[PDB]
What does this fold into?
Amino acid sequence: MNIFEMLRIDEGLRLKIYKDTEGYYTIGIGHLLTKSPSLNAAKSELDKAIGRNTNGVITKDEAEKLFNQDVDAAVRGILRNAKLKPVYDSLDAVRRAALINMVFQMGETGVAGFANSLRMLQQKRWDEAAVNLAKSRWYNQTPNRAKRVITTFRTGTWDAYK
Ligand SMILES: [Cl-]
Ligand SMILES: [Cl-]
It folds into this structure.
């Protein structure tokens, strides 16, 4: 198991524009296109991301390419983030993956907001972090995914994904 496989399980793969858990236009493997309510705006952002007239449809290869970009951008974003980097640097390989997953889902900003949890993680108080991470809109809105990510931080194993 690795980050890519982890995220592929969490996000799924859809080759046609769809609305995510929040109602926003997405495609591929969790690639958010736009938060605007406009499907045209979403088709346009799509064509611009792929570099062709897609008509709202992409191939598997194109989805995998956006995915590679997005995973890399997330890593690079954590590393550049003064609040995130120290956490990430303090974690083992499996747990770093859990942090990446959260950033991929909610953005650097949104994750950055879990200050208390981040500090617990950095202190290696796994059980306490897990409880604190659960008191969040994130957990109440996507509880199954949330639980899988929290299990990963609590345990440091990929058990939640097997
Ligand atoms: Cl893009
Ligand atoms: Cl869920």
Notes: Residues 42 and 131 are 37 Å apart (CA to CA). The chain has nine helices and three strands.
